[PDB]
Amino acid sequence: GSSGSSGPTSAPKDLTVITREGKPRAVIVSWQPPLEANGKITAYILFYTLDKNIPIDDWIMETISGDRLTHQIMDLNLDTMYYFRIQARNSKGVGPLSDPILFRTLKVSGPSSG
Template identity: 40%
Template structure:
C-alpha cells in the first residue's frame, strides 16, 4: 500500500518453513526486473518484523519486490516477486 508521496508500505508473511528463530529479513527491490539480484537495492530489517516502509521511490515507475528471511546461520528461500 502507498505510504506517502514517494514511499510504499510493504508487508509479508514469514516463510512457511522455518529454520530456527528469524533474526531479520532482507527486502530486495528494483524498477528493472531484468537486473541480476546483486544489482537490486536491498534493505535489511532487524528482528521478526513483517512490515517496513520503502522510501524515495518514483511513483511513476513500477517496482518489483522480493523478501528473504535471515536466520542465525543461513538465509531462508527468496519469495516470489511482487510488483507495485
C-alpha cells in the first residue's frame, strides 16, 4: 500500500568530534538534523575509518537512535587520523553522508616532544 520509501537526500551538519575528558580513546561525535531529511529521522548511521582508500562500505558503520544526535566511539587508535561521515535515515531509507572530517586522536604514549 504505502510504497513511498524514498529517504533523506541531505547529510547532517554540526559534525564535531571531541576527545572525552574521562577517556582519550573515546570521542563524542555530535551532529545536527538535515533540512532535506524528507521526514523526521528515526535512526542515524555514522561511519568512521582511519583509511579512506576503502569504500564507505568497508568502513565501520554505527547505528544510532534518531532521537540522539551524538555518538561515542571506544577503542580508537592513538595519534592516528580518523575520518568521520554520518548520515540520516528515516522509516523510508537513508541518504548520503557528510564530508570526511579530519580529527586526530589523543596521544597517551608520547615520546615527550614538548
